[PDB]
C-alpha cells in the first residue's frame, strides 16, 4: 500500500522502483487581458521520474504545444503524465522495468493504474511522505533544458552526480530531499548557500557543486538552519 516513514528503507533495496512527480507538468502564468479579465499562458513543464536507488532521472519535457486546443488541462495533465510513464516503461528492457511506481500525489493513482493495465505485476503506490520534488525546477540545469525545449523531449540525468561513489543511496536520497526542501522553502537563500564560495564549481556533467565530504557537512548544516528558521517565521514559534 502507501509508502511512509515506517517502510522507508524499502526505497533502497534491490527491487527496481520509480517515484513519479507530476507537480511541474502543467505550468502557467496568470495574467490580465486587455479587457481586464484573467487568462493563463502555459509554459514548458516536465515529468520528474526518479529511481531513488540509482539516482537515474527520466526528465520528460512537456512542451506547451501538448495543451493546444485542449480543455480541462489540470485533468488532462494527470493522464498525459500517466501516458508518458507507461510509454517509458514499455521502452525499457524487461529487466530494467520497475516492480513498483510510487506517485507523489494520490490523484495520479487512477490515471497511472488505467494506463498500466498491461502490466498487472507492477504495483502503483501512493506515499504518505511529503516529498519536495516540485522544487526540481530550482535546479538550474534542469530548469534550463525545460525552458529551452522547442518540442517534446526526454533528457536523462543522474540527480546524485557521483555521490554514490562515496555514500549509500539512503544517504544520497536524504541529501537530495534536504537540498530540495531548502530550495522549496527559501529558494534565494538555498541557492546562496550552494554557490557562496566561488572556488567550488559545478562540473559540466553534474548538477550540484563538487563539495568535499567535509564541505557537504557544512552545506547540509546550513540547509537545516535555513529550513528551521523559515519554519519559525511561517508559524511564529
Amino acid at each position: 500500500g502507501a509508502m511512509n516513514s515506517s517502510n522507508y528503507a524499502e526505497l533502497f533495496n534491490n527491487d527496481i522502483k520509480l517515484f513519479v512527480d507530476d507537480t511541474n507538468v502543467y505550468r502557467v502564468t496568470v495574467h490580465k487581458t486587455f479587457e481586464g479579465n484573467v487568462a493563463t499562458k502555459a509554459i514548458n513543464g516536465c515529468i520528474f521520474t526518479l529511481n531513488p536507488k540509482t539516482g537515474h532521472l527520466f526528465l520528460k519535457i512537456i512542451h506547451t504545444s501538448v495543451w493546444a486546443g485542449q480543455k480541462r488541462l489540470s485533468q488532462l495533465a494527470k493522464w498525459k503524465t500517466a501516458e508518458e510513464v507507461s510509454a517509458l516503461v514499455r521502452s525499457l528492457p524487461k529487466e530494467e522495468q520497475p516492480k513498483q511506481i510510487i506517485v507523489t500525489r494520490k490523484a495520479m493513482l487512477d490515471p497511472l493504474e488505467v494506463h498500466m493495465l498491461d502490466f498487472p505485476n507492477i504495483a502503483i503506490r501512493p506515499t504518505e511522505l511529503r516529498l519536495p520534488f516540485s522544487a526540481a525546477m530550482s535546479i538550474d540545469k534542469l530548469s534550463d533544458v525545460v525552458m529551452k525545449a522547442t518540442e517534446p523531449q526526454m533528457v536523462l540525468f543522474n540527480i546524485y552526480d557521483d555521490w554514490l561513489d562515496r555514500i549509500s543511496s539512503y544517504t544520497a536520497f536524504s541529501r537530495l530531499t534536504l537540498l530540495l526542501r531548502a530550495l522549496k522553502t527559501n529558494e534565494e537563500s538555498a541557492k546562496m548557500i550552494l554557490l557562496s564560495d566561488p572556488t567550488i564549481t559545478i562540473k559540466s556533467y553534474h548538477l550540484w557543486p563538487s563539495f568535499t565530504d567535509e564541505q557537504w557537512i557544512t552545506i547540509e548544516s546550513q540547509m537545516r538552519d535555513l529550513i528551521l528558521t523559515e519554519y519559525g517565521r511561517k508559524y511564529n514559534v
Binding site: 488532462l76 493522464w79 501516458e83 487512477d110 490515471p111 488505467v114 494506463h115 493495465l117 498491461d118
Partner: protein
C-alpha cells in the same frame, strides 16, 4: 392463478412471497399460498424463527411446472420441489383449498409494485445466473458469493452475474484510456449492451434481479452488482433516451419498496451521490432523485 402447496410447516418460520410476508408457528396447519398471479416470476423466501441468519428462498414461474414446498429435517430447510404427476398435484391443491389451509397472495388490484420490480426479469435468465439445471426453479440465500467476489469459493453455489470492472482491459480501449475511464459509453453500449447482454431489456432484468436478491436476502454481492450496473449507465455520456427514462422508473420503484430501516446497508452513498449530482445523467433521473431526496435525505 396458481398455487404453491406446502406439505407441512414443522418449524416456526417467517415466509415471504414477493414483497409480502407471514409468520407461521411451529406445526401450525399451514399448507401453502394460492392465487399467485400468472405472468411474472415470483420468489418464496424464508427466515427461521430460531436462526434469523441465512435468509433463503426460491425464484420460480408457475407457468413452468407445478411446484411445492416440503421441509427437510436432515438439511434443516424448506425445499422447493417439482411435482411431475399433474393429477396428484391438482388433487392435493383442491383438498387444501377446500380445507382453507392456504394463504391468498394478497395483491391489491390498483397495485403494480411487483410488475414494476420484475418488468424485465425472466426465469430463463435467472437460471443462467443461478446454475442448477436439473430444477426449473432457483435457490438463493444471504451467503452466496458472486463470480466477481470469488475472483478477488465453491463455483457451483455462485451467483454468475455479468462481471463489470471499471479498471479492466475490457472497460478501457488501448489508446482511449482517459476517454473511456471518464466516459464509460463504449463499455456500456458496445461491450455490454451490444456484446454481452444483446439488448437493454436483458441488462435491466439482471439489474432488477440483483436488487431483489439484495433486498430479500441481504446478499451483499448482489447489492454490489446492482450499484455497478447503475453506475455504468450514469457514468456514460451517451445513453439511448428510452433507457434513461426506463432506468428512472426502475430505480424509483426499487427505492419506493426498500424497507426504510435498511437504507444504511443496502444503499451506497458514493454511487448515489455521484449518480444523482455529479454524473453525466445527474439531470436524467427526475423521479428517482425526488423519491431519494424525500425518503433518504441523510444519505445525500
Amino acid at each position: 392463478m396458481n398455487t404453491v402447496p406446502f406439505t407441512s410447516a414443522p418449524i416456526e418460520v417467517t415466509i415471504g412471497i414477493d414483497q409480502y410476508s407471514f409468520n407461521v408457528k411451529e406445526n401450525q396447519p399451514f399448507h401453502g399460498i394460492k392465487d399467485i398471479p400468472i405472468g411474472h416470476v415470483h420468489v418464496i423466501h424464508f427466515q427461521h424463527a430460531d436462526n434469523s441468519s441465512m435468509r433463503y428462498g426460491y425464484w420460480f414461474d408457475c407457468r413452468m411446472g407445478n411446484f411445492y414446498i416440503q421441509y427437510d429435517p436432515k438439511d434443516g430447510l424448506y425445499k422447493m420441489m417439482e411435482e411431475r404427476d399433474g393429477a396428484k398435484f391438482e388433487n392435493i391443491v383442491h383438498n387444501f383449498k377446500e380445507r382453507q389451509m392456504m394463504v391468498s397472495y394478497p395483491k391489491i388490484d390498483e397495485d403494480d409494485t411487483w410488475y414494476n420490480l420484475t418488468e424485465f426479469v425472466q426465469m430463463d435468465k435467472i437460471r443462467k445466473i443461478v446454475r442448477k439445471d436439473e430444477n426449473q426453479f432457483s435457490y438463493v440465500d444471504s451467503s452466496m458469493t458472486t463470480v466477481q467476489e470469488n475472483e478477488l469459493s465453491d463455483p457451483a453455489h455462485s451467483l454468475n452475474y455479468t462481471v463489470i470492472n471499471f479498471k479492466s482491459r475490457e472497460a478501457i480501449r488501448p489508446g482511449h484510456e482517459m476517454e473511456d475511464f471518464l466516459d464509460k459509453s463504449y463499455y456500456l453500449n458496445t461491450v455490454m449492451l451490444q456484446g454481452i447482454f444483446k439488448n437493454s431489456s436483458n441488462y435491466f432484468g439482471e439489474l432488477q434481479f440483483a436488487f431483489l436478491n439484495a433486498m430479500f436476502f441481504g446478499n451483499y454481492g448482489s447489492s454490489l452488482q446492482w450499484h455497478a450496473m447503475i453506475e455504468l449507465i450514469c457514468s456514460s455520456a451517451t445513453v439511448p433516451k428510452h433507457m434513461l427514462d426506463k432506468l428512472d422508473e426502475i430505480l424509483y420503484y426499487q427505492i419506493k419498496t426498500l424497507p426504510e430501516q435498511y437504507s444504511d446497508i443496502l444503499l451506497n452513498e458514493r454511487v448515489w451521490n455521484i449518480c444523482l449530482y455529479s454524473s453525466f445523467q445527474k439531470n436524467s433521473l427526475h423521479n428517482t432523485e425526488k423519491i431519494m431526496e424525500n425518503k433518504y435525505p441523510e444519505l445525500l
